[PDB]
Amino acid sequence: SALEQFVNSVRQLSAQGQMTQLCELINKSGELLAKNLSHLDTVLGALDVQEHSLGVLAVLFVKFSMPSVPDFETLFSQVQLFISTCNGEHIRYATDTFAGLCHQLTNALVERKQPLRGIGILKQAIDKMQMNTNQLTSIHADLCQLCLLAKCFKPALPYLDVDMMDICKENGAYDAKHFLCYYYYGGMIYTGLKNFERALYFYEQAITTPAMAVSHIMLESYKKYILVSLILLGKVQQLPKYTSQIVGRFIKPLSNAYHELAQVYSTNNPSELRNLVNKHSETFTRDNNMGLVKQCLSSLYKKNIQRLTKTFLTLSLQDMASRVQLSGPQEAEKYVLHMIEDGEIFASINQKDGMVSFHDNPEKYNNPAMLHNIDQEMLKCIELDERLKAMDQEITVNPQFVQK
Amino acid sequence: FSFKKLLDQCENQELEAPGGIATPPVYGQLLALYLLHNDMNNARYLWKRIPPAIKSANSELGGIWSVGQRIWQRDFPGIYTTINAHQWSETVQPIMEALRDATRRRAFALVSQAYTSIIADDFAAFVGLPVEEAVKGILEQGWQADSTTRMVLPRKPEQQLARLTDYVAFLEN
């Protein structure tokens, strides 16, 4: 009855402008909107669907119960079709219910334990809600969790290799939880694929978030930051100067096992490290990062062997497997061979004499291919400077930056 | 070549084609094709996300994650032994016909700069050939063996002017 006036209004208000009042009347709710609207959804979608479908589906999905009851397959199909072919720039006028719909879908999928169907849905929603590809949206924190609870790390790689330079305001909302979760789950994904250089960066961008209270998403971004820094480098990297003081007041004392682990991973001695992993085995397995700690123990040997290259020019395998405590020339042979195969060391084995000869002569910079490296590194800085100038001229002409 | 296209095809048919779980054919094809490209990090998660129903019904997949561990804990004789253990339909036969060549080339490239003198017996296990057949075929490449002791010695085998102008135009603005 009354809905017929509401449905027709969106039909006539749209396709002729008046987009400001459209979002106003959508925000007028409708008091459960007579939830049986499943029939009118298809007809209302004149041309490339419409915008009122988002308003209907947002109310439908969060009835805080029985999503839409067992209409799930139909509800999921409607959501998938809408997101695939919503089209239009109009979907950017209301980036407050779109993100809410995607978040509700993510929560329902996580609860129902099928976080693989939604990886394909939150790939067009991200693509069709951000201005450019360098803008962080609140949906980026949903895909990075859907593809993490359902081990499928590669779909998220295109959305983690972009250096974000803008954050969507989403017309309200966008609490710091989304920003912290994106830069924590991205770090976890990169750690899972053994890309530690960027996992460390992603964790660091979550620790240094401005804060005044302790959140249990920044604790398990310092605990893992320590381990990833100890694996990638030989020591815990220094956090940036602008780090919030809350990390250095409550976060640090709460993580005392990991600082002790770094202390032991400061004097090169695997005997104490192996004992410390077992003594604190409750903490390291309660935080779920047990397995990222054994990587530190395995990396201590690989660090010691590399430290042998700074003093020796030819070592005996039996003699080598007595300073790094490998207990056997046969195992030291494979330990060196694995490191040679991975490009971590420059050495050669001699099974006749049984001796490892360290070369320590990778490259002389007279290669026409190194010129390509310098050219690429120069082009990246050129693009970076162009970006800085571009988002500096936008401040130079700001009417607020003429009065001060 | 052609295997990368197959890989991305199975990736797409895993993501968007099914209702959460794909067919055992494409599942096993992707699992075996990840090993060919040496992507063990992705293969471990592919095996970890497989539902515990295809595993207990299509047991052949459990065979494929019997080669993988051999690549995981690097063991060339284990790889060669395990490859020649099981068999499936015409979906992994050309997969484990290029995997053999890839592994045998990886072994040759491994013992070409890591070792400067290696026993022939160990080299045979590395490459995956009988010792007598391995030594005779070595000599063609130029690697000098040494008989009566079996110690094979492996032997090692357009717009610049525009770019410079672009750099100058940038520095001087």
């Binding site: 130079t396 002409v397 009417p399 003429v402 | 135009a169 001087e172 603005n173």
Partner: peptide, 24 residues
């Protein structure tokens, strides 16, 4: 070079216009 100085002069002209209209 010509494009860069045209852009710089246009930004300066915009800033000057903003300064002028700000006197209201």
């Amino acid at each position: 070079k010509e494009n860069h100085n045209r852009t710089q002069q246009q930004v300066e002209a915009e800033v000057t216009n903003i300064k002028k209209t700000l006197k209201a």
